[PDB]
Design a protein around this ligand. Structure first.
Ligand SMILES: Nc1ncnc2c1ncn2[C@@H]1O[C@H](COP(=O)(O)OP(=O)(O)OC[C@H]2O[C@H](O)[C@H](O)[C@@H]2O)[C@@H](O)[C@H]1O
Ligand SMILES: [Mg+2]
Ligand SMILES: [Mg+2]
Lengths: 180, 332
């Protein structure tokens, strides 16, 4: 909940993981913090980009190898800002009923970024509150971005999230999900 | 703050998931329509009774127009010409320009030659070439109510995207139709088709999409010049088209016959292949009725129901997919 509590959690649970990463694993994590690399990696995994470039293939391989060695040390609640475009296949776009999303499973084919800190205003019209169970394939990332305060938990590809409840107000949608 | 570098991702995510949403609908809509055109070209103008004895089950060649298997016609060509024009934004003068290039120079033909173009279409484009403005060159006669506008406007639904409001849709659908088909009966037909296709784009089940279109058209197009034209659309707009029998379905190039037939073929079948083969085997304007049906079934059932056997026989398949991807990119 607190940044201090988030940083202690990250150190206690991911110090061994981080000091055991190869140089190419570290570079792939740093590269992912570059929005240009982010778009190329997640674009391909999601299918918005059809062609697989060898260099993108290598970055994805090294990031996935890194996160495959990581596991959440306990159950934690994480946060993610996103867009309603991820829900468009689940809705009647001319008769929007967000309550009918309850029970649907969202899949993220790419890497999934989350933050441990809820006391922030996210960019976009969907906020997700994620109940992440112990043992999930995510890693706390400290000192990997150019933002020293960044409190990030990055999940490996293919996470699935079951929608448990929905709140809507002025086109701003809050979604509570269980990470499967 | 603690979100840090993750804050930037949301705008990229929005763009990427918009690409996927559009691609999932656009590619099977285009391929589904084009395949219907290909299936029907070699039997255009053949009678229904001949087709009952010799039904289309696959792409055949060297019938009407003496073309190879997998050859699409003006329906697909003018659809591609509209996609090309829209990439840099809606501009009615670029739209008509590309249509003239199809007619004159074989722009977006399968082998470089125009083997067919409709008469209303040709007469209207020839008027534009001579100085008649794009708002006055379209045919207005009672017998100018062919289906040549409805066969070339499906890209407008994708251009509108998740703008489901009335105003822009109402304007551009009329403007683009009127280039060739300026009679209010034809314009009303365009609104019917666009509304149904938009409702399927929006993820409605097919019967709801149909029912919502009926209410919408009656609500918005009951004043002059459309009030007097609604009667010709009674089988579509009043009651259940899907209760009609084949013997009640007419499959000429008349815009009313064509919309009745294509929507009926879609509502009374349960797969893409069933829909387009049912449409083609009505005889008459087989390529166009099957193109329209294939646009509706394609967007509804999506790529898993479009036979790969048919996709691979389409002339210039790779160029069509490249145009689809360039169009999708322009909509983001
Ligand atoms: N009021 C009416 N009542 C009955 N039939 C009508 C009426 N108005 C028109 N028709 C019939 O509508 C038909 C119009 O045919 P054409 O003018 O060649 O085409 P297009 O420019 O519309 O569009 C391209 C078409 O031609 C290509 O092959 C495409 O694939 C399409 O089939 C005629 O049979 C008219 O008798
Ligand atoms: Mg044709
Ligand atoms: Mg035809």
């Amino acid at each position: 909940t607190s940044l201090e509590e988030s940083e202690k959690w990250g150190i206690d649970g991911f110090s061994v993981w981080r000091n055991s990463l190869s140089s190419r694993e570290i570079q792939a994590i740093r590269d992912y913090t570059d929005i240009w690399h982010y778009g190329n990696m997640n674009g391909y995994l999601r299918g918005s980009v059809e062609k697989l470039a060898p260099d993108n293939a290598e970055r994805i391989k090294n990031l996935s190898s890194a996160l495959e060695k990581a596991e959440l040390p306990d159950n934690i609640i994480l946060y993610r800002g996103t867009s309603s475009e991820i829900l468009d296949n689940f809705l009647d776009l001319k008769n929007l009923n967000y309550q009918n999303l309850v029970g649907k499973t969202i899949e993220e084919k790419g890497f999934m970024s989350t933050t441990t800190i809820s006391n922030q205003t996210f960019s976009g019209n969907v906020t997700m509150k994620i109940n992440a169970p112990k043992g999930s394939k995510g890693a706390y990332l400290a000192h990997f971005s150019e933002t020293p305060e960044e409190a990030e938990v990055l999940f490996n590809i293919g996470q699935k999230m079951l929608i448990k409840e929905v709140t809507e107000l002025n086109g701003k949608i809050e979604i509570i999900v269980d990470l499967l | 703050g603690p979100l840090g570098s993750m804050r930037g991702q949301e705008e990229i995510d929005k763009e990427q998931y918009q690409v996927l949403f559009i691609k999932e609908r656009l590619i099977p809509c285009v391929l589904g329509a084009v395949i219907g055109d290909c299936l029907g070209v070699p039997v255009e103008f053949k009678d229904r009774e001949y087709l009952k004895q010799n039904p289309i089950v696959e792409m055949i060649g060297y019938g009407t127009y003496n073309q190879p298997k997998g050859t699409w016609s003006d329906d697909s060509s003018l659809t591609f010409a509209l996609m090309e024009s829209l990439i840099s934004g809606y501009d009615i003068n670029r739209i008509v320009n590309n249509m003239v290039s199809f007619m004159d120079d074989g722009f977006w033909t399968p082998y470089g030659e125009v083997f067919d173009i409709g008469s209303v279409t040709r007469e209207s484009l020839n008027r534009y070439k001579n100085g008649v403005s794009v708002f006055e060159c379209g045919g207005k006669d009672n017998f100018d109510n062919g289906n040549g506008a409805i066969m070339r406007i499906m890209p407008l639904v994708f251009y509108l995207g998740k703008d489901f409001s009335f105003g822009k849709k109402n304007k551009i659908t009329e403007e683009v139709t009127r280039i060739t088909h300026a009679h209010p009966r034809s314009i009303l037909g365009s609104y019917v088709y666009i509304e149904l296709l938009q409702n399927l784009f929006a993820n409605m089940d097919k019967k709801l999409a149909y029912e919502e279109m009926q209410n919408y058209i009656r609500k918005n197009y009951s004043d002059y010049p459309f009030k007097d034209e609604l009667q010709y659309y009674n089988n579509i707009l009043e009651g259940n088209l899907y209760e009609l029998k084949e013997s009640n379905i007419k499959s000429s190039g008349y815009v009313v016959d064509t919309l009745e037939a294509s929507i009926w073929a879609f509502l009374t079948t349960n797969s893409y292949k069933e829909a387009v083969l049912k449409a083609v085997n009505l005889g008459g304007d087989t390529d166009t009725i099957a193109f329209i049906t294939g646009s509706l079934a394609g967007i509804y059932y999506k790529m898993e129901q479009i036979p790969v056997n048919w996709i691979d026989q389409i002339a210039k398949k790779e160029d069509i997919l490249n145009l689809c991807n360039r169009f999708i990119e322009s909509l983001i």
